Amino acid sequence: MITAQAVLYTQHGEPKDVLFTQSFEIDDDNLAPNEVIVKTLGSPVNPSDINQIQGVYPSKPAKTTGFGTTEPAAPCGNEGLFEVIKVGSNVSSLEAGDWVIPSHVNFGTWRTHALGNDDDFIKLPNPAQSKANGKPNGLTINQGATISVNPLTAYLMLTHYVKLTPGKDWFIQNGGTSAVGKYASQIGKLLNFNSISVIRDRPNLDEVVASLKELGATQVITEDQNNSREFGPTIKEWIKQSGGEAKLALNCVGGKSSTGIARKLNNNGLMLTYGGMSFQPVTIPTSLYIFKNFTSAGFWVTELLKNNKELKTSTLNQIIAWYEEGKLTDAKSIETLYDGTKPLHELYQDGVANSKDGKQLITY
Amino acid sequence: MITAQAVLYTQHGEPKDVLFTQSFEIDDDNLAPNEVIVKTLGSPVNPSDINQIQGVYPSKPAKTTGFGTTEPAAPCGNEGLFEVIKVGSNVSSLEAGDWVIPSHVNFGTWRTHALGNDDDFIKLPNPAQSKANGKPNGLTINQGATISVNPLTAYLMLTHYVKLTPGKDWFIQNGGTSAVGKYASQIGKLLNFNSISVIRDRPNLDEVVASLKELGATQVITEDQNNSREFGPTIKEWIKQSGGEAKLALNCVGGKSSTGIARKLNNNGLMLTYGGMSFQPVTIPTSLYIFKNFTSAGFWVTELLKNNKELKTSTLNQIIAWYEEGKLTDAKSIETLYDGTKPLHELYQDGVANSKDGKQLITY
Numbered sequence: 254m255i256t257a258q259a260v261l262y263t264q265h266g267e268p269k270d271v272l273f274t275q276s277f278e279i280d281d282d283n284l285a286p287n288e289v290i291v292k293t294l295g296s297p298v299n300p301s302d303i304n305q306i307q308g309v310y311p312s313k314p315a316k317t318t319g320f321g322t323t324e325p326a327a328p329c330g331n332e333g334l335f336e337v338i339k340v341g342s343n344v345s346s347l348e349a350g351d352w353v354i355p356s357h358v359n360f361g362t363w364r365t366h367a368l369g370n371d372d373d374f375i376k377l378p379n380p381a382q383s384k385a386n387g388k389p390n391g392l393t394i395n396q397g398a399t400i401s402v403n404p405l406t407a408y409l410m411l412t413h414y415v416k417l418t419p420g421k422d423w424f425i426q427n428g429g430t431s432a433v434g435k436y437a438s439q440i441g442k443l444l445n446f447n448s449i450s451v452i453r454d455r456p457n458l459d460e461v462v463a464s465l466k467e468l469g470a471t472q473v474i475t476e477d478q479n480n481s482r483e484f485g486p487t488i489k490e491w492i493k494q495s496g497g498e499a500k501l502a503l504n505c506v507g508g509k510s511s512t513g514i515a516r517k518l519n520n521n522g523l524m525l526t527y528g529g530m531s532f533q534p535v536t537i538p539t540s541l542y543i544f545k546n547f548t549s550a551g552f553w554v555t556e557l558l559k560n561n562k563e564l565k566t567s568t569l570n571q572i573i574a575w576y577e578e579g580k581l582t583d584a585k586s587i588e589t590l591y592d593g594t595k596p597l598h599e600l601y602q603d604g605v606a607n608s609k610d611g612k613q614l615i616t617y
Numbered sequence: 618m619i620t621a622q623a624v625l626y627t628q629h630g631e632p633k634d635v636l637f638t639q640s641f642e643i644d645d646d647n648l649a650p651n652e653v654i655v656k657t658l659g660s661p662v663n664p665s666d667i668n669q670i671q672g673v674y675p676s677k678p679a680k681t682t683g684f685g686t687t688e689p690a691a692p693c694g695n696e697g698l699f700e701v702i703k704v705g706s707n708v709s710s711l712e713a714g715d716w717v718i719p720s721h722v723n724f725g726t727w728r729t730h731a732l733g734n735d736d737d738f739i740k741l742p743n744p745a746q747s748k749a750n751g752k753p754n755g756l757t758i759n760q761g762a763t764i765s766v767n768p769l770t771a772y773l774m775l776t777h778y779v780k781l782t783p784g785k786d787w788f789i790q791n792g793g794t795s796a797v798g799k800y801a802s803q804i805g806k807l808l809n810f811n812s813i814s815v816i817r818d819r820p821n822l823d824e825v826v827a828s829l830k831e832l833g834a835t836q837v838i839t840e841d842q843n844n845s846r847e848f849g850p851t852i853k854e855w856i857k858q859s860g861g862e863a864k865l866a867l868n869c870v871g872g873k874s875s876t877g878i879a880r881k882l883n884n885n886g887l888m889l890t891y892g893g894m895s896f897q898p899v900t901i902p903t904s905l906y907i908f909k910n911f912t913s914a915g916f917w918v919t920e921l922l923k924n925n926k927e928l929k930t931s932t933l934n935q936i937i938a939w940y941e942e943g944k945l946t947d948a949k950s951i952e953t954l955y956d957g958t959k960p961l962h963e964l965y966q967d968g969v970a971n972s973k974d975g976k977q978l979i980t981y
């Protein structure tokens with residue numbers, strides 16, 4: 254008989270307002286033949302998780318009484334890393350000790366345990382298994398807990414929409430310091446795509462520029478350079494010299510930033526909007542559409558991979574392989590350990606409030 | 618020897634400031650074997666013509682001294698209807714009396730005459746020729762003079778990008794009172810597309826609404842209604858109750874208007890931006906891209922048809938056929954006749970100044 258904790262809400266709103274923690278019990282002695290019990294190792298706070306609770310994200314778990322509430326309640330969090338604790342009599346694809354992520358969104362990963370069927374999960378190698386398998390590296394908890402959204406998002410935006418000629422063509426991305434952006438820089442490096450990362454200026458600009466170039470940005474500019482008519486020819490020359498074109502823009506900021514990166518594409522450019530961190534709309538001069546044949550589209554990993562297990566699997570497999578080979582590193586998280594002294598929902602509330610500090614991971 | 622008149626400018630700027638009339642001589646007796654002389658029958662004042670004169674349009678005729686000026690000067694106007702006055706010895710694609718339009722932009726149509734080669738012109742049937750061909754109608758001067766831009770633009774936007782299901786699907790367009798808008802409404806009716814036209818409010822709204830519905834708009838709303846969150850569900854009902862979807866948005870306004878019509882599309886909607894009458898940029902909420910898989914693109918008839926003679930021909934032929942069959946009517950022009958007493962440039966300056974009154978056509 255396991256006592257678990259889950260972060261719930263019964264009504265949408267700001268996480269600081271509507272979240273609470275619900276204790277509930279899992280009976281490890283009553284597993285159906287295809288059922289599995291998992292224990293959470295870590296799960297991040299993503300913007301989508303927050304948007305989901307706020308009610309402005311049209312993919313969400315049902316509100317149910319399943320965690321022992323009287324009011325229907327929804328769990329929180331869409332990705333995370335779990336460890337298999339026990340499996341039913343008919344489960345052969347998972348065993349105790351295995352690492353898994355949810356196979357689908359809306360599973361609720363802001364909680365200590367879960368009961369599910371074996372097909373609710375996708376197996377990741379644990380570090381012991383990686384090492385036994387002759388890999389130079391095993392996954393860290395943060396790498397496994399964050400493998401399913403941001404790395405896939407970067408990979409798919411860079412490969413699924415426009416073919417960049419290796420060693421020649423460019424993508425331009427804003428939110429250069431974001432977790433997605435750091436994955437995008439690395440994957441650009443691994444696939445030999447040139448890239449410009451746009452970041453907000455900061456006192457240690459030089460340090461951050463150096464870090465992003467190491468990850469794999471070709472050039473790094475500030476949003477002020479992004480805004481600059483004067484600086485524009487600098488960017489054109491970079492591209493001219495490469496013999497390639499700027500064919501793809503990645504936008505998770507909106508507002509002026511989206512305008513700026515759109516302007517820097519060659520004619521017949523494509524922008525994918527995948528976030529709006531500024532809360533400002535995507536703003537594009539009429540002339541880009543008419544005269545430069547700019548196209549502005551969206552990207553939603555959840556929808557793309559909704560009914561494409563094949564694409565999810567091969568992408569996820571590539572990310573796993575890169576980690577095991579040491580070719581990819583994670584967007585690092587600020588980690589907060591749950592030990593039962595402070596209610597679980599307060600840790601996540603803190604993670605939401607502190608997300609400005611950088612990606613937050615709640616660990617167990 | 619023919620004495621002609623051309624509207625020119627030596628320096629870019631507002632038409633009211635920079636235009637003048639230049640007399641020039643055309644020799645009707647010494648034509649090269651491929652050369653053609655034409656007499657202008659009518660030419661309209663279009664936004665792009667003004668933008669060229671203003672120097673804010675990326676495609677413009679070269680400044681030249683060929684009209685007999687000291688300073689180099691450019692001609693004005695991109696479309697018009699001409700009558701063939703005389704052809705060279707090797708010309709067999711055109712005869713005297715034939716009706717033609719320019720085959721390419723930047724021809725300079727704000728003038729009485731032109732000398733060019735036969736391939737500078739595209740033949741339309743004159744009313745004699747339509748009659749002899751058994752059509753119930755021949756083209757009018759305004760229909761010929763304005764056939765080459767706005768109706769091709771409306772047709773191509775409606776048919777070249779997304780397939781609307783006849784009798785079911787919708788497009789939504791702003792600038793509903795524009796010439797292009799009025800063509801689109803009719804072409805929508807002819808192809809059995811449902812549509813919403815968004816227009817600016819005005820004293821005679823009821824009359825304008827009736828007029829556009831007569832042309833073919835299924836529904837007409839004001840920009841206020843376009844902006845209204847409360848009115849939104851009413852528009853969604855129109856589309857849902859028809860059994861179709863709103864798949865296409867046509868934008869020539871920009872700004873809040875572009876936002877509003879984008880919001881009315883179903884998932885996987887496409888917006889085509891073909892103008893920016895508000896001078897505000899195309900503004901799209903991030904959520905439409907991510908969650909509605911909205912796409913925003915451009916339309917420039919000049920670029921699209923620039924190397925697609927077959928598509929241009931097919932479209933032009935259909936527009937001609939509908940006029941001939943009496944199935945399509947022109948967006949009406951306010952016509953100013955040049956009798957040679959008032960300087961030609963003054964007629965066009967007036968046309969420009971009065972273009973807010975509606976499409977202006979100078980006739981000869």
Ligand SMILES: NC(=O)c1ccc[n+]([C@@H]2O[C@H](COP(=O)([O-])OP(=O)(O)OC[C@H]3O[C@@H](n4cnc5c(N)ncnc54)[C@H](OP(=O)(O)O)[C@@H]3O)[C@@H](O)[C@H]2O)c1
Nearest residue numbers: 300428430431432433453505527528529530531552553554
């Ligand atoms: N569509 C999808 O499928 C999908 C999937 C995953 C993620 N996303 C989106 O990707 C974006 C980043 O996600 P993440 O997980 O990588 O988050 P993250 O690690 O927390 O990074 C947040 C980023 O936003 C920047 N930022 C914050 N406020 C800003 C502002 N007002 N103007 C400009 N930049 C601002 C931050 O830059 P600073 O360092 O300067 O503060 C940082 O780069 C989010 O919009 C998220 O919703 C979308």
Ligand SMILES: NC(=O)c1ccc[n+]([C@@H]2O[C@H](COP(=O)([O-])OP(=O)(O)OC[C@H]3O[C@@H](n4cnc5c(N)ncnc54)[C@H](OP(=O)(O)O)[C@@H]3O)[C@@H](O)[C@H]2O)c1
Nearest residue numbers: 664770792794795796797817869891892893894916917918
């Ligand atoms: N990209 C291409 O290939 C292409 C081809 C043809 C035309 N166009 C563009 O299509 C547009 C219409 O051209 P047209 O020849 O049809 O001109 P038009 O007949 O003169 O129509 C002008 C339209 O603009 C509206 N308008 C004017 N000022 C406005 C403002 N501040 N806000 C909102 N609406 C405003 C007018 O509405 P009101 O009645 O209320 O005044 C009217 O609907 C222009 O932008 C033109 O440049 C583009």
